Amino acid sequence: LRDNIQGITKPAIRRLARRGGVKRISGLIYEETRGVLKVFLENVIRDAVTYTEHAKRKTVTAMDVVYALKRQGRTLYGFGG
Amino acid sequence: NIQGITKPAIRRLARRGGVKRISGLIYEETRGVLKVFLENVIRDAVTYTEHAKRKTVTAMDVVYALKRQGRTLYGFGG
Amino acid sequence: TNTEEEKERLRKEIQKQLHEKIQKEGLARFNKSDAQDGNENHAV
Amino acid sequence: SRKESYSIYVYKVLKQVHPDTGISSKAMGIMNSFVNDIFERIAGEASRLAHYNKRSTITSREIQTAVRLLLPGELAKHAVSEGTKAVTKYTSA
Amino acid sequence: KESYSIYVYKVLKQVHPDTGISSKAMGIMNSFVNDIFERIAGEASRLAHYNKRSTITSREIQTAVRLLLPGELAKHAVSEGTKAVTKYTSAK
Amino acid sequence: NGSKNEEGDYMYIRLNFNSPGMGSSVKKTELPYEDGDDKEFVRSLTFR
Amino acid sequence: KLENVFVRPAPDSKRVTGTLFIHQNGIRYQSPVRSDHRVDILFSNIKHLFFQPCKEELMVIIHCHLKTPLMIGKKKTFDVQFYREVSDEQEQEERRRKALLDKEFRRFAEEISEASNGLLDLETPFRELGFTGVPFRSSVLCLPTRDCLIQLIDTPFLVVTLEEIEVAHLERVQNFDLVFVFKDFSKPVVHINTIPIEMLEFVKQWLTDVDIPYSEGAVNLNWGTIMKTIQADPYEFFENGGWSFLGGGESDDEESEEEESEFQVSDEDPEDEDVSEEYSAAED
Amino acid sequence: PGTVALREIRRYQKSTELLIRKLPFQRLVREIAQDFKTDLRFQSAAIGALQEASEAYLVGLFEDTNLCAIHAKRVTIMPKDIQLARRIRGER
Amino acid sequence: HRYRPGTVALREIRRYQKSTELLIRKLPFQRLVREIAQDFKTDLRFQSAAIGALQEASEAYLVGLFEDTNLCAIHAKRVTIMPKDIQLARRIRGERA
Amino acid sequence: AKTRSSRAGLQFPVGRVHRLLRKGNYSERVGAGAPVYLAAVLEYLTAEILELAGNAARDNKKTRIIPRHLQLAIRNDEELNKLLGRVTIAQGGVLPNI
Amino acid sequence: TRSSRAGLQFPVGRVHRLLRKGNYSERVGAGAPVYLAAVLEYLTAEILELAGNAARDNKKTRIIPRHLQLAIRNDEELNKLLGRVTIAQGGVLPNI
């Protein structure tokens, strides 16, 4: 997979901003946000994968993600716990 | 005893924080914020002390209360 | 609570009368002519 | 496999509280996650206290003071009252 | 009561021969060691309980180190730990 | 209001006077000049 | 005459006790240390005359709120306060001193009202209807009277005449703030900040019992911009709808949200199993 | 200008449904996961949880950005507001 | 000679980012701590090290808060920190709701 | 009253909580009233949450509680939201706030 | 001693006893304490190296808390690791 960050379309970021209460959005935001999101996911996934590899498994399960989030103080209800 | 935190002390703390100019209400605002912080921390410490069945507040209670908040402090026996 | 809330409906009814009363007073206190420099007062 | 969850207990509590209300499956998943999370928090804090005080037993005092630390004012007061009432009546019975 | 002061002093003289340390800094270093120990042991315990194991081995310690420390730091620490474990295991 | 500027061997003073548009904080009831759409105003004079 | 009285604002930096005298068309405060520090107040210029007894406070007060401001020393003031502090078997002697001073000051305030030939009513605050708030920089007990909302203990003094109020606005109702707008739009609005939310329903009732309209809002408004717009054209302001922010009817077509259609299809297990006898080894 | 935006804000605040498309997000997640271990499998609930966490995080970040932009007496959010928010949060 | 408002300010900033000594007088802080503690349980005793730790933590917290406040103030294109800056910083941190 | 829940007038399982406290590696020993106290607290808290969730579902004319109503109940209660301020709810949405 | 066998200076017996008495697991393998001691020794060596550098930079031959604070807040990886801890008498970095 090569450069799939542009799958976070501009209307999607606009919708996320509207849910956040933003009325007028600068054009550099979309790229800013994209980078931020990348850095987030890379930090969460690196831990989820670390759990998956430690269980000597080959599939990333929902509990791996839940523990990775819980480690950052990002506890998630609804998917187990 | 909250008026013991004088205006020069708040000015000193802001200068070590790099603040160049200070409004006049900053002092009361800071006194309120400090009071809230100290209230929470001392409440946790006194909870620890009561549980340990003591009448004196030790340094261990303060250190565990700060670890409880996430404000880990080094150099007091932790 | 029904009795207290019916007294609160009277409280709201009074408040509605008061807003309508002040609206009528304001329109009587300020005339279109007064808005346009009423009683002379043309930037003396 | 028999998986354990608090779903039936949440149904019981709900019918006790709201006889004419129902819960979705996802809301039950959230409630189960919440119950597990609170249990983990309380047990971890009780263990931390026991180790702080060089003890090797978790008694109702440790749990009570854990509730005092975790819950805010009114919540702590009511939950402490409820727990002491239940423990007193279980002891009496 | 036990502490790490003598070991910290030995390590200091191993890295910096002509440098001393105050008592307050030795206290801070002891607190730091205890903190890092507690973090690593808690992560190892959580991992063991996730994986349904009764034992804390070197695999749990290694993966907790990987989870906790940043990239280069974790890499160097894992290198050191593996080196020490192999040197201890090779002899007896 | 006015301003003063030092420039080489000379000192400059600019004096600004009341004119509509560049008005003062006075209310609409009392103007420092007489009302007049056809009135032209001395807005500023600069001396050295 | 009333002896051993302090005046606020003080005519000289030094606080000195004086004597208050009743004359034919007003009152005179006169310091014993200097004849030149006289304060003369005409009955025609007093708007409100308050008596505040020493019951839970350490001082008894005689407050004159003025129609036109007076120059006392270097300060222009609408308010002139006359007071004495009682802060001195001991508990009984203190109670006797408080009661004696309250009787002396009350009688003297009645004698001022009588000397005015019915131009001045003596007002006493209703302590039971008092609420705590911040009109300036300190939390103070605001006390209603017959015709005014007052605070006389701490300087600066608050005196709000109820008849001069056009509308009250309750900000941050979602502690709240209370804003008084006056009938004279040139007069700045009065804020009473940080009122406990427990007093909200009481304040709403009290405003209704006094015939003052009120409105509530989640946000603090920029009254300094609003009052300038209203001053620019007061007629256009009332033409549109005036206060009670009515707006242009339906701002945006109502889209609703609740549809009374239960979703999230879930099997009603109710008394289900999946647990039975959860292993309960009674070790301890 | 500014009314359809508020209407959309209201609409989207009334709802809970995920805003990022599911398959592009899956591809992004796989692309990012392709660095840490080659040819990994993912549960569907894992991707769903990741999307929920990501959208919650971004909404909170946009809340803080809106607060900063309003603080600057503006209505338009700019990248420096995001940077200030991430700085104050303690984000690297 | 006459200093322009802000030169002594920068001198003080340089002087206080160099030192580490506690900037609050000890007795006022002890009296404040005892006043606060007296509202939870009467006849409580404090080790001097407990007061010292509390003072260190409180000053560290306040300095971090003042740094965030300064960042907010500079963001608004100003130089004077204001109560709204403090409230915004505490809200963004997640301390005030 | 055979089950320990009945002897304490509870609905949560005392026995399961006891087993989890023991087979959980928390301390060498466990009391006899710690499971009872913890079960009482947990039941009280769940009742507290379900009351407000039922209120919110009844304000939306709905018979079933969904994650939206749990989100509303948590983010609308001062104490619960303070307790659960660092918790993300799946399909919970946001609070109307303009 | 088990520290000598692994070529270490930190104690293996003490760490094993602390892991044993800390209620962490039913049993503790023998390769965990050696690995953990090695990690702790590496981290303290790094900390003391940078703190000695910082103390020489100030021309002092003894490490005080100020040099520990400077070493921590000046190293990116350590400052990310010790992101929430406050050091008594550590001060702040000079930053205008």
Side-chain angles (χ1 to χ4, degrees), chain C residues 20-34:
Chain C
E20 287 182 19
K21 183 181 175 188
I22 280 159
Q23 182 63 9
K24 288 169 186 163
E25 290 175 348
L27 290 169
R29 284 173 198 174
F30 301 103
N31 284 310
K32 190 179 182 181
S33 60
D34 305 347

mmCIF file with all atom_site columns, all heavy atoms in Angstrom, chain C residues 20-34:
data_model
loop_
_atom_site.group_PDB
_atom_site.id
_atom_site.type_symbol
_atom_site.label_atom_id
_atom_site.label_alt_id
_atom_site.label_comp_id
_atom_site.label_asym_id
_atom_site.label_entity_id
_atom_site.label_seq_id
_atom_site.pdbx_PDB_ins_code
_atom_site.Cartn_x
_atom_site.Cartn_y
_atom_site.Cartn_z
_atom_site.occupancy
_atom_site.B_iso_or_equiv
_atom_site.pdbx_formal_charge
_atom_site.auth_seq_id
_atom_site.auth_comp_id
_atom_site.auth_asym_id
_atom_site.auth_atom_id
_atom_site.pdbx_PDB_model_num
ATOM 1   N N   . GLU C 1 20 ? -44.094 42.245 27.712 1.00 0.00 ? 20 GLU C N   1
ATOM 2   C CA  . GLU C 1 20 ? -45.039 42.964 26.850 1.00 0.00 ? 20 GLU C CA  1
ATOM 3   C C   . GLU C 1 20 ? -45.267 44.416 27.298 1.00 0.00 ? 20 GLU C C   1
ATOM 4   O O   . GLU C 1 20 ? -45.410 45.319 26.468 1.00 0.00 ? 20 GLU C O   1
ATOM 5   C CB  . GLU C 1 20 ? -46.406 42.271 26.846 1.00 0.00 ? 20 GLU C CB  1
ATOM 6   C CG  . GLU C 1 20 ? -46.447 40.951 26.062 1.00 0.00 ? 20 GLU C CG  1
ATOM 7   C CD  . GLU C 1 20 ? -47.858 40.337 26.061 1.00 0.00 ? 20 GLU C CD  1
ATOM 8   O OE1 . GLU C 1 20 ? -48.828 41.095 26.331 1.00 0.00 ? 20 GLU C OE1 1
ATOM 9   O OE2 . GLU C 1 20 ? -47.969 39.131 25.744 1.00 0.00 ? 20 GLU C OE2 1
ATOM 10  N N   . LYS C 1 21 ? -45.322 44.651 28.611 1.00 0.00 ? 21 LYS C N   1
ATOM 11  C CA  . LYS C 1 21 ? -45.487 45.992 29.180 1.00 0.00 ? 21 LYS C CA  1
ATOM 12  C C   . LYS C 1 21 ? -44.293 46.882 28.838 1.00 0.00 ? 21 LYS C C   1
ATOM 13  O O   . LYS C 1 21 ? -44.498 47.993 28.360 1.00 0.00 ? 21 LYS C O   1
ATOM 14  C CB  . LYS C 1 21 ? -45.714 45.874 30.691 1.00 0.00 ? 21 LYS C CB  1
ATOM 15  C CG  . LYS C 1 21 ? -45.958 47.233 31.353 1.00 0.00 ? 21 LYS C CG  1
ATOM 16  C CD  . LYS C 1 21 ? -46.143 47.042 32.859 1.00 0.00 ? 21 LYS C CD  1
ATOM 17  C CE  . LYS C 1 21 ? -46.252 48.400 33.548 1.00 0.00 ? 21 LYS C CE  1
ATOM 18  N NZ  . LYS C 1 21 ? -46.236 48.244 35.021 1.00 0.00 ? 21 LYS C NZ  1
ATOM 19  N N   . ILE C 1 22 ? -43.069 46.395 29.031 1.00 0.00 ? 22 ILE C N   1
ATOM 20  C CA  . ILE C 1 22 ? -41.855 47.163 28.727 1.00 0.00 ? 22 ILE C CA  1
ATOM 21  C C   . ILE C 1 22 ? -41.699 47.412 27.235 1.00 0.00 ? 22 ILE C C   1
ATOM 22  O O   . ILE C 1 22 ? -41.342 48.517 26.844 1.00 0.00 ? 22 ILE C O   1
ATOM 23  C CB  . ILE C 1 22 ? -40.636 46.472 29.354 1.00 0.00 ? 22 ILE C CB  1
ATOM 24  C CG1 . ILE C 1 22 ? -40.672 46.897 30.836 1.00 0.00 ? 22 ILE C CG1 1
ATOM 25  C CG2 . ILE C 1 22 ? -39.296 46.868 28.703 1.00 0.00 ? 22 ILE C CG2 1
ATOM 26  C CD1 . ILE C 1 22 ? -39.891 45.965 31.727 1.00 0.00 ? 22 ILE C CD1 1
ATOM 27  N N   . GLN C 1 23 ? -42.063 46.443 26.400 1.00 0.00 ? 23 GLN C N   1
ATOM 28  C CA  . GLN C 1 23 ? -42.080 46.627 24.955 1.00 0.00 ? 23 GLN C CA  1
ATOM 29  C C   . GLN C 1 23 ? -43.023 47.771 24.529 1.00 0.00 ? 23 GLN C C   1
ATOM 30  O O   . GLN C 1 23 ? -42.648 48.643 23.746 1.00 0.00 ? 23 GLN C O   1
ATOM 31  C CB  . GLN C 1 23 ? -42.464 45.276 24.335 1.00 0.00 ? 23 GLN C CB  1
ATOM 32  C CG  . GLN C 1 23 ? -42.488 45.280 22.805 1.00 0.00 ? 23 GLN C CG  1
ATOM 33  C CD  . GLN C 1 23 ? -41.132 45.563 22.174 1.00 0.00 ? 23 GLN C CD  1
ATOM 34  O OE1 . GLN C 1 23 ? -40.086 45.608 22.805 1.00 0.00 ? 23 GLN C OE1 1
ATOM 35  N NE2 . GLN C 1 23 ? -41.138 45.776 20.885 1.00 0.00 ? 23 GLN C NE2 1
ATOM 36  N N   . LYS C 1 24 ? -44.240 47.813 25.094 1.00 0.00 ? 24 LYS C N   1
ATOM 37  C CA  . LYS C 1 24 ? -45.206 48.899 24.857 1.00 0.00 ? 24 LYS C CA  1
ATOM 38  C C   . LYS C 1 24 ? -44.710 50.239 25.401 1.00 0.00 ? 24 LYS C C   1
ATOM 39  O O   . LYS C 1 24 ? -44.874 51.261 24.739 1.00 0.00 ? 24 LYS C O   1
ATOM 40  C CB  . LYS C 1 24 ? -46.561 48.535 25.481 1.00 0.00 ? 24 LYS C CB  1
ATOM 41  C CG  . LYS C 1 24 ? -47.274 47.426 24.693 1.00 0.00 ? 24 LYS C CG  1
ATOM 42  C CD  . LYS C 1 24 ? -48.487 46.886 25.466 1.00 0.00 ? 24 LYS C CD  1
ATOM 43  C CE  . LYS C 1 24 ? -49.058 45.681 24.708 1.00 0.00 ? 24 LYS C CE  1
ATOM 44  N NZ  . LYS C 1 24 ? -49.966 44.852 25.543 1.00 0.00 ? 24 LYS C NZ  1
ATOM 45  N N   . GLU C 1 25 ? -44.073 50.217 26.578 1.00 0.00 ? 25 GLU C N   1
ATOM 46  C CA  . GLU C 1 25 ? -43.497 51.459 27.166 1.00 0.00 ? 25 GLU C CA  1
ATOM 47  C C   . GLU C 1 25 ? -42.394 52.000 26.252 1.00 0.00 ? 25 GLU C C   1
ATOM 48  O O   . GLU C 1 25 ? -42.439 53.197 25.938 1.00 0.00 ? 25 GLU C O   1
ATOM 49  C CB  . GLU C 1 25 ? -42.926 51.188 28.558 1.00 0.00 ? 25 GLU C CB  1
ATOM 50  C CG  . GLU C 1 25 ? -43.981 50.917 29.612 1.00 0.00 ? 25 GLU C CG  1
ATOM 51  C CD  . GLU C 1 25 ? -43.425 50.517 30.969 1.00 0.00 ? 25 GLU C CD  1
ATOM 52  O OE1 . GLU C 1 25 ? -42.214 50.228 31.052 1.00 0.00 ? 25 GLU C OE1 1
ATOM 53  O OE2 . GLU C 1 25 ? -44.203 50.504 31.940 1.00 0.00 ? 25 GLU C OE2 1
ATOM 54  N N   . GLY C 1 26 ? -41.438 51.151 25.863 1.00 0.00 ? 26 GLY C N   1
ATOM 55  C CA  . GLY C 1 26 ? -40.326 51.583 24.992 1.00 0.00 ? 26 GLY C CA  1
ATOM 56  C C   . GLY C 1 26 ? -40.838 52.234 23.720 1.00 0.00 ? 26 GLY C C   1
ATOM 57  O O   . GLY C 1 26 ? -40.390 53.354 23.414 1.00 0.00 ? 26 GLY C O   1
ATOM 58  N N   . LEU C 1 27 ? -41.737 51.556 22.999 1.00 0.00 ? 27 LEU C N   1
ATOM 59  C CA  . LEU C 1 27 ? -42.338 52.139 21.789 1.00 0.00 ? 27 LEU C CA  1
ATOM 60  C C   . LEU C 1 27 ? -43.073 53.463 22.049 1.00 0.00 ? 27 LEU C C   1
ATOM 61  O O   . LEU C 1 27 ? -43.161 54.298 21.158 1.00 0.00 ? 27 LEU C O   1
ATOM 62  C CB  . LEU C 1 27 ? -43.325 51.125 21.178 1.00 0.00 ? 27 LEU C CB  1
ATOM 63  C CG  . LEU C 1 27 ? -42.672 49.883 20.552 1.00 0.00 ? 27 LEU C CG  1
ATOM 64  C CD1 . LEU C 1 27 ? -43.754 48.849 20.234 1.00 0.00 ? 27 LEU C CD1 1
ATOM 65  C CD2 . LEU C 1 27 ? -41.932 50.221 19.256 1.00 0.00 ? 27 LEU C CD2 1
ATOM 66  N N   . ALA C 1 28 ? -43.630 53.664 23.249 1.00 0.00 ? 28 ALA C N   1
ATOM 67  C CA  . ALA C 1 28 ? -44.260 54.931 23.622 1.00 0.00 ? 28 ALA C CA  1
ATOM 68  C C   . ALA C 1 28 ? -43.244 56.013 24.028 1.00 0.00 ? 28 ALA C C   1
ATOM 69  O O   . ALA C 1 28 ? -43.498 57.200 23.825 1.00 0.00 ? 28 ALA C O   1
ATOM 70  C CB  . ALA C 1 28 ? -45.254 54.655 24.759 1.00 0.00 ? 28 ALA C CB  1
ATOM 71  N N   . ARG C 1 29 ? -42.121 55.619 24.652 1.00 0.00 ? 29 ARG C N   1
ATOM 72  C CA  . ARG C 1 29 ? -41.051 56.525 25.105 1.00 0.00 ? 29 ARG C CA  1
ATOM 73  C C   . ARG C 1 29 ? -40.237 57.075 23.935 1.00 0.00 ? 29 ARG C C   1
ATOM 74  O O   . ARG C 1 29 ? -39.847 58.236 23.988 1.00 0.00 ? 29 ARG C O   1
ATOM 75  C CB  . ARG C 1 29 ? -40.112 55.798 26.083 1.00 0.00 ? 29 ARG C CB  1
ATOM 76  C CG  . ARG C 1 29 ? -40.679 55.602 27.503 1.00 0.00 ? 29 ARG C CG  1
ATOM 77  C CD  . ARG C 1 29 ? -39.704 54.722 28.309 1.00 0.00 ? 29 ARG C CD  1
ATOM 78  N NE  . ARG C 1 29 ? -40.293 54.102 29.521 1.00 0.00 ? 29 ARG C NE  1
ATOM 79  C CZ  . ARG C 1 29 ? -39.667 53.220 30.294 1.00 0.00 ? 29 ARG C CZ  1
ATOM 80  N NH1 . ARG C 1 29 ? -38.391 52.964 30.180 1.00 0.00 ? 29 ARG C NH1 1
ATOM 81  N NH2 . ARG C 1 29 ? -40.287 52.517 31.195 1.00 0.00 ? 29 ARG C NH2 1
ATOM 82  N N   . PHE C 1 30 ? -39.974 56.258 22.919 1.00 0.00 ? 30 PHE C N   1
ATOM 83  C CA  . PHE C 1 30 ? -39.186 56.637 21.750 1.00 0.00 ? 30 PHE C CA  1
ATOM 84  C C   . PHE C 1 30 ? -40.104 56.749 20.531 1.00 0.00 ? 30 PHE C C   1
ATOM 85  O O   . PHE C 1 30 ? -40.726 55.768 20.139 1.00 0.00 ? 30 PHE C O   1
ATOM 86  C CB  . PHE C 1 30 ? -38.045 55.619 21.568 1.00 0.00 ? 30 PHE C CB  1
ATOM 87  C CG  . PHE C 1 30 ? -37.121 55.530 22.777 1.00 0.00 ? 30 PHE C CG  1
ATOM 88  C CD1 . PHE C 1 30 ? -37.212 54.450 23.673 1.00 0.00 ? 30 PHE C CD1 1
ATOM 89  C CD2 . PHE C 1 30 ? -36.191 56.557 23.024 1.00 0.00 ? 30 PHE C CD2 1
ATOM 90  C CE1 . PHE C 1 30 ? -36.395 54.403 24.822 1.00 0.00 ? 30 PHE C CE1 1
ATOM 91  C CE2 . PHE C 1 30 ? -35.355 56.500 24.156 1.00 0.00 ? 30 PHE C CE2 1
ATOM 92  C CZ  . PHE C 1 30 ? -35.460 55.423 25.056 1.00 0.00 ? 30 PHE C CZ  1
ATOM 93  N N   . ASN C 1 31 ? -40.219 57.942 19.936 1.00 0.00 ? 31 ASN C N   1
ATOM 94  C CA  . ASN C 1 31 ? -40.963 58.148 18.692 1.00 0.00 ? 31 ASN C CA  1
ATOM 95  C C   . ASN C 1 31 ? -40.022 58.248 17.486 1.00 0.00 ? 31 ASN C C   1
ATOM 96  O O   . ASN C 1 31 ? -38.891 58.720 17.595 1.00 0.00 ? 31 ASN C O   1
ATOM 97  C CB  . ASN C 1 31 ? -41.836 59.411 18.802 1.00 0.00 ? 31 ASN C CB  1
ATOM 98  C CG  . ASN C 1 31 ? -43.075 59.194 19.650 1.00 0.00 ? 31 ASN C CG  1
ATOM 99  O OD1 . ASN C 1 31 ? -43.825 58.252 19.475 1.00 0.00 ? 31 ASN C OD1 1
ATOM 100 N ND2 . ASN C 1 31 ? -43.364 60.091 20.559 1.00 0.00 ? 31 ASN C ND2 1
ATOM 101 N N   . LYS C 1 32 ? -40.514 57.843 16.310 1.00 0.00 ? 32 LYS C N   1
ATOM 102 C CA  . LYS C 1 32 ? -39.692 57.951 15.072 1.00 0.00 ? 32 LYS C CA  1
ATOM 103 C C   . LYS C 1 32 ? -39.052 59.344 15.011 1.00 0.00 ? 32 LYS C C   1
ATOM 104 O O   . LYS C 1 32 ? -37.862 59.428 14.649 1.00 0.00 ? 32 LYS C O   1
ATOM 105 C CB  . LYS C 1 32 ? -40.552 57.675 13.837 1.00 0.00 ? 32 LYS C CB  1
ATOM 106 C CG  . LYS C 1 32 ? -39.787 57.513 12.532 1.00 0.00 ? 32 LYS C CG  1
ATOM 107 C CD  . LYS C 1 32 ? -40.679 57.211 11.348 1.00 0.00 ? 32 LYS C CD  1
ATOM 108 C CE  . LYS C 1 32 ? -39.909 57.004 10.062 1.00 0.00 ? 32 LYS C CE  1
ATOM 109 N NZ  . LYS C 1 32 ? -40.811 56.729 8.919  1.00 0.00 ? 32 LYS C NZ  1
ATOM 110 N N   . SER C 1 33 ? -39.807 60.390 15.372 1.00 0.00 ? 33 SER C N   1
ATOM 111 C CA  . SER C 1 33 ? -39.280 61.781 15.362 1.00 0.00 ? 33 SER C CA  1
ATOM 112 C C   . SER C 1 33 ? -38.148 61.936 16.387 1.00 0.00 ? 33 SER C C   1
ATOM 113 O O   . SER C 1 33 ? -37.137 62.584 16.050 1.00 0.00 ? 33 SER C O   1
ATOM 114 C CB  . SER C 1 33 ? -40.384 62.775 15.614 1.00 0.00 ? 33 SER C CB  1
ATOM 115 O OG  . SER C 1 33 ? -40.995 62.544 16.876 1.00 0.00 ? 33 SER C OG  1
ATOM 116 N N   . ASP C 1 34 ? -38.316 61.369 17.587 1.00 0.00 ? 34 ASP C N   1
ATOM 117 C CA  . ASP C 1 34 ? -37.264 61.438 18.638 1.00 0.00 ? 34 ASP C CA  1
ATOM 118 C C   . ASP C 1 34 ? -35.986 60.778 18.111 1.00 0.00 ? 34 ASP C C   1
ATOM 119 O O   . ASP C 1 34 ? -34.899 61.342 18.343 1.00 0.00 ? 34 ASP C O   1
ATOM 120 C CB  . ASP C 1 34 ? -37.731 60.786 19.943 1.00 0.00 ? 34 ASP C CB  1
ATOM 121 C CG  . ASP C 1 34 ? -39.040 61.340 20.481 1.00 0.00 ? 34 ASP C CG  1
ATOM 122 O OD1 . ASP C 1 34 ? -39.482 62.395 19.987 1.00 0.00 ? 34 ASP C OD1 1
ATOM 123 O OD2 . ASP C 1 34 ? -39.609 60.706 21.391 1.00 0.00 ? 34 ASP C OD2 1
#
